[PDB]
From a paper:
We report the cryo-electron microscopy structure, at near-atomic resolution, of the double-stranded RNA [name] (RnQV1); this virus infects the fungus [name], a pathogenic ascomycete to a wide range of plants. At difference most dsRNA viruses, whose capsid is made of protein homodimers, RnQV1 is based on a single-shelled lattice built of 60 P2-P4 heterodimers. Despite a lack of sequence similarity, P2 and P4 have a similar α-helical domain, a structural signature shared with the dsRNA virus lineage. In addition to organizing the viral genome and replicative machinery, P2 and P4 have acquired new functions by inserting complex domains in preferential insertion sites.
Here we report the three-dimensional (3D) cryo-EM structure of the RnQV1 W1118 capsid at 3.7 Å resolution. The ~470 Å-diameter T = 1 capsid shows 12 outwardly protruding decamers at the pentameric positions (orange), each bearing five copies of P2 and P4. Each pentameric capsomer is formed by an inner ring of five P2 monomers surrounded by an outer ring of five partially intercalated P4 monomers, in which the asymmetric unit is a P2-P4 heterodimer. Our near-atomic models for P2 and P4 had 972 and 1005 residues, respectively, of the total 1356 (P2) and 1059 (P4) amino acids. The structure of P2 (built from 29 α-helices and 20 β-strands) and P4 (29 α-helices, 9 β-strands) was organized similarly and was divided into two domains, a shell (S) and a protruding (P) domain (right). P2 and P4 overlapped considerably at the S domain. Both had a long α-helix tangential to the capsid surface, the α16 helix in P2 (36 Å long, 24 residues) and α15 in P4 (50 Å, 33 residues), a common characteristic of the dsRNA virus lineage CP (right, arrows). Analyses with Fatcat, Cath and Dali servers showed that this P2 domain has structural similarity, in addition to ferredoxin, to gelsolin and profilin, two actin-binding proteins with a variety of actin regulatory functions. The P4 Val648-His805 domain (in insertion site 2) has a surface cavity in which the last visible P2 C-terminal residue, Gly973, contacts P4 Ile791. We hypothesize that this surface crevice in P4 participates in proteolytic processing of the P2 C-terminal domain. In addition to the numerous weak interactions in the buried intra- and interdimeric surfaces that stabilize the capsid, there are five molecular hooks formed by short loops or α-helices that extend further on the rough contact surfaces, and contribute to pentamer stability (labeled I-V).
Author numbering:
A (entry chain A): 2 to 973
B (entry chain B): 1 to 1005
Write the structure that this text describes.
């Protein structure tokens, strides 16, 4: 400051700071930026959900926030077109084919640990606009003098007192010396509480007993305490080895360090794996108000999905009464395999509204002075209530975080009062009455700033939308834990201060069901996140293998590769308020997002901008890894018997079923001993069994007792209860990994035809056909090997069967200059373009034909459940050969309309085998002789009739022999 | 989208203390609302003689273009939605040789809607001319004119649904404004300003919300074409058009339904598995439906329309009610007659069980366009009994087109290709086969309220305000002709594609397995349609709207067969094309004395007239040249013969059979439950050819717990409260059960019943199972019944997988059926109304099928026309090739005119006239020598009486449309072509202010 005394400019800089700070203070009260104009009223959320690269991709703007029947399908189509030269049917012509492969994406609550750390801070980076005016920008001078002209004392006489005890209470918990906790000014803590609660009661789809049994409630209908709302959990279920995918990666990794909430959420999920369960009733109970070392869990799983759980109590009236019933949230399993979690309005909260009105707040309680929330007493209550326990709240996801944030603010039982509603209200909270008045009014009114809001909006959007693709043959991705912070609920300006009644553009009530905000929050996580899965699919290890170092294991081999991971560079971080510190293992998502859609990077879409600026870091080690919960470990079609990694990939089987993307690529049970790095290809997997303390006769686990023992598939389990088996497989070249599809549809190139040579990964002309051959043999259905001379580590023979796509052409492990493709089973059978796989194998070898791909892929929203028919139209092997050049022949060539002869096309690329006796061999002694002609017999009997109208009868008949008796000679 | 709307970003600043004007009144967007009318109303009066200029059956109408500023305003708001760029417009351009044929068939074509199949023929009197020469002096024998009519029956395809339209909302100022109405209600005002009259308030806003489902906006272009399909379907039903009936009565009265294959006093032939199940149904009097043959021996079933499509709805289902995710379309206001028609189209949903045409009636409902007449947009419902007859039924189409497609005139024509693609040529000759085709359906993804748009824009009256006029009918009957003209182009093209596969692709029989024979023919088509689009990347543009796979459309087949520019048939963006379904399921005849077919030696050398006379005097179905029990007979080795494959073992027909005894547990429970229905349901009508996989997949789905299969079992009395699970029904394997096996009465005597009840698809429907679940399960049941009928009769229960079923396997390869040959004969005659057109030249001594100097046609049509002519005279012309085969043209071993395919060079040797009215046409005298036979044709279109027609057009009604409306202004003033339209407000900025209240925070003093 002394120096700036002495700079020619120095005195101006000083006059100016002082002068601006002095005028800005005088009238804090008329300060807001929400109401400036129609977009930046209602927080600049008009247009976020669909960027323009993405509109092109075709996702509709209904927004992907689960509604009763919503599925998102990413399906790419390609249309390969082979120009066949020495056909086996008459000598030229080309043969277009067309197919489509469909991904599945899920969106829902993301389970990986939430690292939210909540600390009151005192700063004006977010806070509120009234607060912003209130403290001068740079010159530190007491302001209460000025502030008082503008705020009655009862608020500020009282608030400060709230700020004193609240400080003491936190000093209670961390035993911090209390100099070092600070009174809050930050409002990301609030923006988050009211925002989280809204993007839960509006996003979710609610089951009202409108009558008789459960029903849906229309976009416009009351939510009674008794509304099951189920939130789609970014999970998938099935049959075959992976019962659920994808689990949190880390639940699986050998030492967990999990919290209380996950331990009763992961066990809940695992019981959900048995091939016959439907909705695991997790009830939590019995939690005392000193502390929580005593809460009984119980699991009752009823084996149908819709008998989801129920409680006898309307909204609890004071938390201690709310406590007794205890908090129970069921989990149920889907249609379309989206594991849906269901919960009840009574649960999220307990009834704050203890309205006390318009007099100086009493010695100890919080009061919210709400101006002109008329009859929204119920919508308000839901927004601002200590969660049912009001203490340690055991909801599985964000709610648990929201409850924790609420709990930082007040001890169990600080009774909150509402003023400006008459003495009571009902809880009905019909929705807009929720978002019209309730979340929008609530934040605009308190002058709470865009910046607090984009942060809450993106953070929620981040822990309600982690979208991970559905590959069930292998896992998905292990959606990584995100590190974020937020200050508690009390807020200087929001909590005890007056409600600021003036609007600027769009008016609080005229905001409908907040589709803009709600879709906007939901979309942002999915689009940004999708690249990360998509990015993972797109890029992998160059040589197809992942190094393993000695005793290893997959979690551990996971962090060693990280040392060699590569990511794009962030750029222009103006928006994040110096919360910009790294670990070099945390790259914000929007590191990836730039990679895929490169186009987002110049700052023209909030979706990229909003995301990178204030978007939780995540963590990036475990992201390669996949975890899924499998039925048993050690009898899996593909345990590649450890040794192949030892000697080398003598064989690899990729076998792609009739319809889906998926490849059940092979893995090497991956704690396998040795003295040096041996390069694995292509997947390293690890099976683990965890056993958890047993239930009392009914359903007891005490939360603390819950202790998990890692053991492996070679350690004995008769002792230790088990619940599920964890398998995590890490992989390099994403072939037949559901993502590959995710990578293609979204990053991948589209709508320009490019020949096999350009697509293929091989180098010389010669070994570019061999790959193009290897796949085209694999479409029809007859396995095809590409065999390599043993040197290098590539795995001696790679064979694939089944319906492969061309971009998949791209990912097949090299092939150069040693190796020719050999067909494993040559049995010739009817097929679709060909028959007798070998003639094909010769066909490729001659440069007879080339196949040029073009494909266009669209991301889609499917809202109504649809049925599809896959027809493989397929020619015979008996009579594929025969049909001998119909067109050189000069009789056919002459009964066919001319172009036909002219155009290039053909039904088949290569002819088959094995025709049965070859002519109409009927032993003579079967040809009767036509009897001699009768000359004079009139022909009205045989000459064809001519058109007359009507229809008349057929007389035929039979008798039905008793069916039962023949059913007796059996079928069929 | 990339940018927030321009209207939303703009600010009041710069401001000043003196900026009095209210917010609403600046930041108001620039709109100049009235938009000039753009098109011309009337056909034009001739200037001289004052006689109205005529274009047939035609109504042309005027439509609002919108002012430049106003579309810009609509745009700032719709930042983030995708509306298809315009579909291209192209006439169909054909090759030169085919150009002349397509023009002629097109010129007049008049269907004659007899018993469930479209009818056309050109009556033709032709003078056979025999040309031969003596040393350079010509000779001619033309004794008499044959009078014969070529009839081309067009029977509808078998439809099934898979592919659902992608969500792009077809582009209209009805669609653009719907998109705003959805975005404004949902995402609160301030994603748009109040966008309609009546959307201002709230309690207007709430009533619009509760109805209109969330993803719910404009796809008329797709919902229109499926409506067109079903009314055209309903036009075959209640054909007379003097029919007057109640809707229940219409459902109950039994018209013939158009089943697969021809049937003759002593044989049936070439009928699909569905047809063979229904043949037993007719034969054994167990079902209520009787199989009957229309003239020429064609095939038909006599069920009630209710019975085919509509069975399995419990009494919850009627009238496409609100918030069921269905389409819910707006009815214009008209006499109950028309309102009752729209109600009856999508009566309690009727799923696709195919009678040949039952399909068409079904199609509207499955895609979910389900008109509503209740509820505030569309007029008061019309009483149970309002008798819509074919006149009010046509009105509905007429209006459907005027208000769908916004008078765009690409989409409306584009519909015709899809409607034309649904119709085959029929099968008449007694072993047709050669029919491996089914139109696969799309169901629209996007559901939006029909009356929501109309109620929200009605300023005065509370009802949907589109008004029917007597001009919609002129459009209806005009469109009926446009369909009637385009169908001849489609049906011709399809035949050519079939010929292309038949001649050239390799088709062969092993063990006389017909389906496997047919399946190959389907594959070739499937590859002769994919090449038509003509690039890899243009297909993706043509796809954009549809998200079934790229299954190529059925008329793409016609585009290949036909001259082949693929833009005209389904455009680069063509909402709702139907792709190809594998409907090839069999041939399968049967006889009066169940028997196989005798094979007749004919020995080739020494053509004698008397052996050929005897053959003509033989019967039409049963003679078959080669017996293929053991051998694979390709048409290169065996041209032109029927290969009669003998009765069908258990073994062929495995991928079809639905009773088997291999089931593991708690699928044993499900399958026993299915069998018990099958054995009991008197009166079931079959057409769904359920395979072994359909029941496999159904029982797998039914066993595993999903909420749907779970609720089903709790409904139907299995598995919740079941104590007799284990033993009661898991060891009950049929061939236990007592008493009657086809009657619902279960004694209290009976021992061994599965469960002591029978559920019909009303209770199962009244315990709430999707109409899809109950239908498919109920469909399986009916199929198992269917199949029970065949097993009983069959040589055995297929205990052995070579056990002989009662019917046949006989395929006529190297032969075109009567339907295909009549199709060529009809088209061939239209080009030869005047000219001679010598047909067969040098009948002996070169190929029959030849192309030379002047043709005007390929050369199938030349010999095809010749066949149909020799049919109606009395001729049996045998074409015998050196090698080993011999087949006739005119009359045949099949019966009636059937030209033989030339994979082997055919040469004529002798003609045999059945009966002698000694005034023959010189042909026998030209085969001794070798000469050319010129055929001077005179044809007369098969024009029926008014009370059986596809389209009646009103030639006089051009008096109405001609004049061009206009409002000539007297007393000067200025009225340009400008009418008012909608307008919208836009966002604007409103600055709000709460009524001041004092609590005890605020400063006051």
């Amino acid at each position: 400051a002394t120096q700036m005394q002495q700079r020619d400019n120095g005195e101006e800089t000083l006059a100016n700071i002082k002068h601006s700070a002095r005028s800005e203070l005088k009238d804090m009260n008329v300060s807001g930026l929400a109401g400036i104009n129609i977009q930046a009223g209602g927080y600049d959320l008009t247009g976020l959900s669909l960027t323009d690269e993405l509109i092109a991709q075709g996702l509709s703007n209904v927004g992907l926030l689960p509604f009763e029947h919503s599925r998102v399908v990413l399906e790419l189509a390609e249309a390969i077109t082979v120009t066949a030269n020495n056909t086996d049917m008459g000598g030229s012509g080309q043969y277009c084919e067309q197919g489509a492969w469909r991904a599945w994406l899920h969106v829902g609550l993301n389970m990986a640990k939430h690292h939210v750390r909540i600390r009151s801070s005192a700063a004006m980076d977010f806070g509120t606009h009234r607060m912003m005016a209130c403290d001068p920008a740079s010159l530190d001078a007491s302001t209460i003098s000025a502030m008082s002209r503008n705020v009655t004392t009862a608020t500020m006489n009282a608030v400060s007192r709230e700020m004193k005890a609240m400080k003491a209470l936190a000093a209670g918990r961390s035993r911090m010396s209390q100099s070092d906790i600070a009174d809050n000014n930050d409002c990301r803590g609030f923006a988050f509480g009211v925002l989280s609660r809204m993007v839960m009661h509006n996003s979710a789809r609610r089951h009202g007993v409108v009558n008789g049994r459960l029903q849906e409630l229309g976009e416009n209908d009351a939510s009674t305490a008794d509304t099951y709302l189920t939130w789609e959990l970014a999970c998938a279920h099935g049959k075959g080895e992976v019962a659920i995918t994808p689990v949190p990666a880390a639940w699986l990794d050998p030492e967990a360090q999990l919290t209380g909430r996950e331990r009763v959420f992961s066990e809940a999920l695992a019981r959900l794996v048995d091939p016959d369960v439907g909705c695991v009733h997790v009830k939590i109970d019995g939690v005392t108000q000193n502390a929580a070392e005593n809460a009984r869990v119980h699991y009752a799983t009823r084996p149908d999905p819709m008998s989801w759980l129920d409680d006898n109590t309307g909204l609890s009236a004071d938390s201690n009464a709310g406590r007794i019933s205890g908090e129970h949230y069921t989990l149920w399993k889907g249609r379309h395999s989206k594991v849906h979690l269901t919960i009840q309005l009574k649960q999220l909260y307990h009834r704050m509204s203890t309205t006390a009105a318009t007099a100086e707040p009493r010695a100890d309680s919080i009061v919210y002075y709400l101006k002109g929330f008329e009859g929204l007493g119920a919508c308000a209550e839901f927004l601002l209530a200590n969660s049912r326990f009001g203490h340690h709240s055991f909801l599985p996801g964000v709610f648990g975080v929201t409850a924790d944030v609420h709990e930082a603010a007040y001890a169990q039982n600080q009774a909150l009062f509402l003023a400006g509603i008459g003495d009571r209200m009902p809880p009905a909270t019909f929705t807009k009455a929720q978002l019209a008045t309730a979340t929008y009014a609530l934040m605009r009114r308190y002058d709470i700033s865009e910046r607090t809001c984009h942060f809450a909006i993106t953070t929620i959007g981040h822990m309600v939308a982690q979208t991970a693709v559905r590959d069930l043959n292998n896992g998905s991705l292990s959606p990584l834990p995100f590190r974020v912070n937020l200050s508690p609920f009390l807020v200087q300006g929001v909590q005890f201060w007056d409600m600021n009644d003036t609007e600027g553009s769009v008016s609080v009530h005229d905001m409908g069901i907040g589709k803009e905000l709600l879709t906007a929050t939901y979309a942002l996580g999915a689009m940004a996140s999708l690249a990360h899965v998509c990015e993972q699919g797109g890029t992998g290890e160059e040589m197809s293998a992942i190094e393993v170092s000695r005793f290893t294991d997959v979690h551990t081999v996971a962090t060693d590769l990280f040392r060699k991971v590569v990511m794009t560079e962030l750029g222009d971080l103006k928006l994040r308020g110096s919360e910009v510190t790294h670990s070099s293992q945390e790259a914000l998502f929007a590191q990836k997002m730039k990679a895929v859609w490169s186009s987002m990077a110049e700052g023209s879409t909030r979706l990229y901008n909003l995301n990178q600026a204030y978007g939780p870091f995540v963590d990036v080690q475990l992201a390669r890894i996949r975890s899924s919960f499998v039925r048993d470990i050690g009898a899996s079609r593909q345990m590649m018997d450890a040794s192949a990694l030892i000697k080398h990939a003598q064989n690899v089987t990729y076998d792609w079923p009739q319809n889906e993307s998926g490849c059940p690529v092979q893995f090497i049970a991956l704690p396998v001993p040795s003295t040096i790095t041996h390069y694995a290809t292509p997947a390293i997997g690890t099976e683990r069994w965890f056993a958890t303390t047993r239930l009392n006769a009914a359903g007891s686990k005490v939360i603390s007792e819950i202790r998990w023992t890692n053991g492996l598939n070679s350690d004995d389990r008769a002792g230790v209860h088990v619940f599920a088996y964890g398998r995590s497989t890490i992989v390099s070249s994403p072939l037949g990994c559901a993502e590959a599809m995710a990578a293609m549809v979204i990053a991948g190139e589209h709508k320009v035809v490019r020949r096999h040579t350009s697509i293929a990964r091989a180098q010389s002309a010669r070994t570019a056909n061999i790959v193009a051959g290897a796949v085209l043999g694999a479409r029809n259905g007859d396995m095809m090997t590409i065999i390599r001379p043993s040197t290098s580590v590539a795995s001696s023979a790679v064979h694939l069967r089944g319906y492969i796509p061309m971009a998949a052409m791209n990912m097949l492990p090299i092939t150069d200059g040693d190796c020719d493709l050999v067909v494993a089973d040559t049995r010739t059978r009817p097929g679709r373009m060909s028959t007798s796989p070998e003639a094909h194998r010769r066909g490729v070898l001659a440069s007879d034909y080339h196949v040029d791909i073009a494909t266009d892929g669209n991301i889609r929203h499917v809202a109504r459940e649809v049925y599809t028919v896959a027809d493989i139209p397929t020619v015979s092997e008996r009579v594929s050969g025969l049909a001998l050049r119909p067109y050189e022949r000069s009789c056919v060539r002459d009964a066919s309309t001319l172009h036909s002869m002219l155009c290039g096309a053909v039904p088949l690329l290569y002819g088959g085998g094995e025709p049965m006796k070859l002519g109409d061999n009927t032993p003579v002694t079967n040809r009767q002789a036509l009897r001699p002609p009768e000359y004079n017999r009139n022909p009205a009997l045989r000459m064809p009739a001519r058109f007359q109208m009507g229809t008349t009868a057929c007389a035929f008949t039979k008798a039905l022999g008793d069916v039962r008796a023949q059913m007796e000679l059996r079928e069929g | 989208m990339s940018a927030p709307s321009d209207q939303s970003q703009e600010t009041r600043s710069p401001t000043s203390v003196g900026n009095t004007v209210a917010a609403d009144v600046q930041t108001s967007v620039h709109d100049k609302p009235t938009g000039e009318l753009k098109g011309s109303d009337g056909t034009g009066i001739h200037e001289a003689t004052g006689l109205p200029i005529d274009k047939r059956g035609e109504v042309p109408t005027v439509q609002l273009e919108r002012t430049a500023e106003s579309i810009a305003k609509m745009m700032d708001l719709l930042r983030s939605e995708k509306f298809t760029a315009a579909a291209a417009d192209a006439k169909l351009m054909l090759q030169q040789e085919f150009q002349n044929i397509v023009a002629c068939a097109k010129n007049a074509p008049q269907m004659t809607v007899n018993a469930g199949r479209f009818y056309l023929g050109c009556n033709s009197t032709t003078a056979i001319i025999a040309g031969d020469t003596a040393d350079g002096y010509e000779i001619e024998y033309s004794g008499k004119r044959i009078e014969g009519q070529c009839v081309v029956a067009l029977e509808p395809l078998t439809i099934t649904l898979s592919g659902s339209t992608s969500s792009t909302q077809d582009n209209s100022d009805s669609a653009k404004l719907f998109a705003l109405a959805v975005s404004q209600v949902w995402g609160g005002a301030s994603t748009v300003g109040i966008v309609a009259p009546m959307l201002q308030t709230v309690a207007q806003e709430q009533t619009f919300r509760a109805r209109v489902e969330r993803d719910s906006g404009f796809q008329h272009h797709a919902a229109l074409t499926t409506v067109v399909t079903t009314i055209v379907g309903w036009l075959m039903h209640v054909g007379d058009s003097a029919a007057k009936r109640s809707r229940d009565g219409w459902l109950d009265h039994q018209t013939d339904f158009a089943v697969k294959g021809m049937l003759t006093p002593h044989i049936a032939s070439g009928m699909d598995w569905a047809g063979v199940q229904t043949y037993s149904a007719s034969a054994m009097e167990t079902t209520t439906d009787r199989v009957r043959a229309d003239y020429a021996g064609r095939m038909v079933v006599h069920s009630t329309l209710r019975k085919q499509t509509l069975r399995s709805r419990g009494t919850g289902d009627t009238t496409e009610t609100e918030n069921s995710g269905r389409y819910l379309l707006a009815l214009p206001k008209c006499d109950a007659g028309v309102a009752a028609a729209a109600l009856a189209l999508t009566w309690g949903k009727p799923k696709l069980g195919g009678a040949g045409h039952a399909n068409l009636t079904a199609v509207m409902s499955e895609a979910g366009v389900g008109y509503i007449t209740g509820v505030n947009g569309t007029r008061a419902t019309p009483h149970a009994d309002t008798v819509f007859g074919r006149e009010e039924l046509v009105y509905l189409l007429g209006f459907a087109l005027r208000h769908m497609a916004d008078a765009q005139e690409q989409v409306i024509r584009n519909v015709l290709a899809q409607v034309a693609s649904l119709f085959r040529p029929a099968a008449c000759s007694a072993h047709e086969w050669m029919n491996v085709h089914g139109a696969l359906m799309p169901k629209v993804s996007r559901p939006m309220n029909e009356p929501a748009f109309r109620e929200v824009w009605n300023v005065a009256n509370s009802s949907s305000d589109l008004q029917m006029i007597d001009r919609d009918k002129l459009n209806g009957e005009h469109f009926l002709r446009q369909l009637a003209q385009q169908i001849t182009v489609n049906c011709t093209g399809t035949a050519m594609a079939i010929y292309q596969a038949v001649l050239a692709g390799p088709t062969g029989i092993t063990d006389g397995d017909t389906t496997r024979l047919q399946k190959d023919l389907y594959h070739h088509l499937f590859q002769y349609a994919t090449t038509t689009y003509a690039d890899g990347v243009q297909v993706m543009q043509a796809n954009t709207r549809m998200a079934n796979k790229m299954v190529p459309p059925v008329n793409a087949l016609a585009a290949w067969g036909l001259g082949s520019s693929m833009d005209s048939f389904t455009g680069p963006h063509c909402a709702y094309y139907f792709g190809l379904a594998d409907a090839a399921d069999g041939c399968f005849y049967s006889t009066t004395t169940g028997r196989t077919l005798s094979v007749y030696a004919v020995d080739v050398n020494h053509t004698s007239s008397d052996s050929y006379l005897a053959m003509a005097q033989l019967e039409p179905g049963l003679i078959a040249t080669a017996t293929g029990t053991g051998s694979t007979i390709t048409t290169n080795v065996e041209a032109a013969g029927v290969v009669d494959g003998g009765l069908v073992t258990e073994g062929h027909v495995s991928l079809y059979t639905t009773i088997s005894a291999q089931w593991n547990g708690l699928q044993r429970e499900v399958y026993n439950w299915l069998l018990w229905h099958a054995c009991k349901t008197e009166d079931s009508s079959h057409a769904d050819i359920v395979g072994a996989e359909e029941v496999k997949s159904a029982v797998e789905w039914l066993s595993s717990n999903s909420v749907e299969a779970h609720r089903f079992r709790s409904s139907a009395g299995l598995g919740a409260t079941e104590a007799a699970g284990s033993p009661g029904r898991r060891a009950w394997r049929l061939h236990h059960y007592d008493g009657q096996i086809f009657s619902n009465v279960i004694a209290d005597t009976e021992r061994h019943p599965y469960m002591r009840r029978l559920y019909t698809p009303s209770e199962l429907r009244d315990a709430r199972n999707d109409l899809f679940v109950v239908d498919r399960i109920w469909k399986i049941v009916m199929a198992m019944r269917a199949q029970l009928m065949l097993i009983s009769v069959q040589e055995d229960g297929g205990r052995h997988q070579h056990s002989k079923h009662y019917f046949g396997e006989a395929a006529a390869i190297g032969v075109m059926g009567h339907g295909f040959t009549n199709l060529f004969a009809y088209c061939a005659s239209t080009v030869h109304g005047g000219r001679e057109a010598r047909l067969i030249s040098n009948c002996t001594d070169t190929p029959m099928y030849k192309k030379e100097a002047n043709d005007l046609v390929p050369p199938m049509m030349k010999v095809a026309q010749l066949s149909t002519l020799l049919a109606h005279g009395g001729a049996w012309c045998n074409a015998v090739n050196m090698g080993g085969n011999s087949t006739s043209i005119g009359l045949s071993i099949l019966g009636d005119g059937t030209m033989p395919l030339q994979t082997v060079p055919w040469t004529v040797n002798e003609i045999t006239y059945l009966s002698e009215e000694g005034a023959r046409h010189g042909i026998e005298a030209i085969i001794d020598t070798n000469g050319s036979v010129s055929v001077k044709v005179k044809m007369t279109m098969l024009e029926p009486r008014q009370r059986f027609c596809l389209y009646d057009d009103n030639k006089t009604s051009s008096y109405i449309t001609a004049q061009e409306s206009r409002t000539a202004t007297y007393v000067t003033l200025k009225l340009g072509g400008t009418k008012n339209a909608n307008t919208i407000s836009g966002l604007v900025a409103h600055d709000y202010k709460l009524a001041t209240t004092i609590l005890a925070s605020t400063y006051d003093k």
